[PDB]
Amino acid sequence: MMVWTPVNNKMFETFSYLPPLTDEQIAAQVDYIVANGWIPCLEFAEHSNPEEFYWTMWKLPMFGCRDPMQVLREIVACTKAFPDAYVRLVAFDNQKQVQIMGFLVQRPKTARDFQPANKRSV
Amino acid sequence: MMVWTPVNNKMFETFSYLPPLTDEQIAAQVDYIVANGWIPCLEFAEHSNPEEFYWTMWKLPMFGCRDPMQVLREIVACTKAFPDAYVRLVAFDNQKQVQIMGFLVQRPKTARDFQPANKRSV
Amino acid sequence: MMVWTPVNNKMFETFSYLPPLTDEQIAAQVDYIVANGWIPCLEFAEHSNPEEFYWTMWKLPMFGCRDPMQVLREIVACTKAFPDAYVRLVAFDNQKQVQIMGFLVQRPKTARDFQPANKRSV
Amino acid sequence: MMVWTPVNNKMFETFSYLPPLTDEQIAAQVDYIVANGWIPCLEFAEHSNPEEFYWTMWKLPMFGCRDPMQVLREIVACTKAFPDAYVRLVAFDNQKQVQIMGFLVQRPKTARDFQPANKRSV
Amino acid sequence: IVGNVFGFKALRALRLEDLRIPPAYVKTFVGPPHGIQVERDKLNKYGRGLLGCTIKPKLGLSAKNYGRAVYECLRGGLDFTKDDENVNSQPFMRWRDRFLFVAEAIYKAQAETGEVKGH
Ligand SMILES: [Mg+2]
């Protein structure tokens, strides 16, 4: 019997219970956005609290973007400008008018409020 | 006339006003649980606040346990995994469906918010 | 025109706008209590906030005390036991059933939230 | 496309989106007060929060003042007495009975919660 | 549509398979309090199915144990837990006692995980 730790075990919604996403895994998610015609967008924040609905938009949603390399380059530019921020990649569906995907691509390095996968239970 | 100090004199419910429990004393409480057929369970928390009802369960309540040594071993294992935590031993009565005993078996070492017995009054 | 400073200028009710009370001045206030037949009492606290009604009683109110030396000795004893606390001398009238006098006899030394008399305006 | 930074980008009402005011620019604002017959006044505070309506008045509003040099000398005197405070120059119109102008003339030096003009976007 | 006709002696069985609700009639209804898109916006949850869990046993748990089970469930990664359909208010657990303990459990699990929780 392993015990799920209540200590510094914060999660950040979709994919947070999986191993950290590799560059290849992030690129595969971006291909998913493009294959489905959804609108990529980046958002960032100093802090992440469950009570806080809005983050800050990086530039504008990438309307008409069908090029995964473009999305990956904006991830680089966003994280470069805010190297200590939480940064997430999201995508919008304008037909249902809702966010249809989203996951973290960066956390602050000074953060020690979450566990590596093998330290989640004791 | 001695004055009961208001300063760093926090208490933690049952047995807090007695001298700290010896290993023998803890063992005797565990015998009591077993003699009465109650369900032993361990719980732990980083912090202890009177307003906070739930702590985190260590594993599961020890249903069917009639072996005091088993309970004592789980105390060791719980405190080993969480050496800085408040840890309490409790027991459940499934007939009345209520917790029927409970007391602290560990506090954080970094805690200076309580007094030794002979420092409670000045 | 001098400007009354808003910065670290906390006050503590009766007599706080006067020069700090000398030993002789405190002794004169105690004589006042005794001459009027009122009940002396000491109270203390770690912190002083305008929102906080009650402090901690030092022992019991000195019922029947007609001896100023006794009151002064209790001041010494209270401040010795709590050298870092706010400590006030108060007096009760049991006919009107109300506190009839009261003033600080000790503040914490670590406190820098009040001004000396000549620094209250700039 | 430049991104407006959410990080340490606090503003302080009128003129905060412009380059910091030079001595000559402040003097020109004072000339404006005098030319219009308005009442100059200085106010200051340790902290500036959007929720906090009142600051502390420096002395009294300069009723009957028609001399810009007098106003400038009070700015010097106010900032000298409170070199770490927010200080603003305001002016009142007694016919409409309302503050008719106002802007910061000093911020705390220890403040790093705002950006220089060229660092507002990334 | 289904009031009397299913009991007519002249038929042996009757099943209503489908209804065409026309827009002019649909427009007379308030309808769902929020709906899918608004719900996801209110929960701030995107990109996957939501996860829930009925507390068990169905009946027989006290309010305090209900909240205990709820906290432990939510803290492990479920978005939701729920009362069993037949958990209303009963001698073993009165509803208001439950509501209060459940609210404590939701709050504790939300704070521990950093994710929005409900029950
Ligand atoms: Mg069910």
Swiss-Prot record, chains A, B, C, D:
Family as reported in the entry's similarity comment: Belongs to the RuBisCO small chain family.
Molecular-function GO terms, alphabetical: ribulose-bisphosphate carboxylase activity
Record's subcellular location: Plastid, Chloroplast
Protein function: RuBisCO catalyzes two reactions: the carboxylation of D-ribulose 1,5-bisphosphate, the primary event in carbon dioxide fixation, as well as the oxidative fragmentation of the pentose substrate. Both reactions occur simultaneously and in competition at the same active site. Although the small subunit is not catalytic it is essential for maximal activity.
Identification of the protein by name: Ribulose bisphosphate carboxylase small subunit, chloroplastic 1
Range covered out of full length: 46 to 185 of 185
A biological-process GO annotation: reductive pentose-phosphate cycle
Entry-annotated residues carrying N-methylmethionine: 1
Keyword terms of this UniProt record: Calvin cycle, Carbon dioxide fixation, Chloroplast, Methylation, Photorespiration, Photosynthesis, Plastid, Transit peptide
Further comment found in the protein's record: The basic functional RuBisCO is composed of a large chain homodimer in a 'head-to-tail' conformation. In form I RuBisCO this homodimer is arranged in a barrel-like tetramer with the small subunits forming a tetrameric 'cap' on each end of the 'barrel'.
Organism placement in taxonomy: Eukaryota, Viridiplantae, Chlorophyta, core chlorophytes, Chlorophyceae
Subunit structure as annotated in this protein's UniProt entry: Heterohexadecamer of 8 large and 8 small subunits.
From Swiss-Prot, chain E:
Residues of the active site: 56
Residues binding Mg(2+), per UniProt: 82, 84-85
Compartment annotation: Plastid, Chloroplast
Positions where 4-hydroxyproline occurs in the chain: 32
Source taxon at top rank: Eukaryota
Post-translational modification: The disulfide bond reported in 1IR2 may be the result of oxidation during crystallization.
Subunit structure: Heterohexadecamer of 8 large chains and 8 small chains; disulfide-linked. The disulfide link is formed within the large subunit homodimers.
Further comment found in the protein's record: The basic functional RuBisCO is composed of a large chain homodimer in a 'head-to-tail' conformation. In form I RuBisCO this homodimer is arranged in a barrel-like tetramer with the small subunits forming a tetrameric 'cap' on each end of the 'barrel'.
Name the UniProt record assigns to this protein: Ribulose bisphosphate carboxylase large chain
Species of provenance: Chlamydomonas reinhardtii
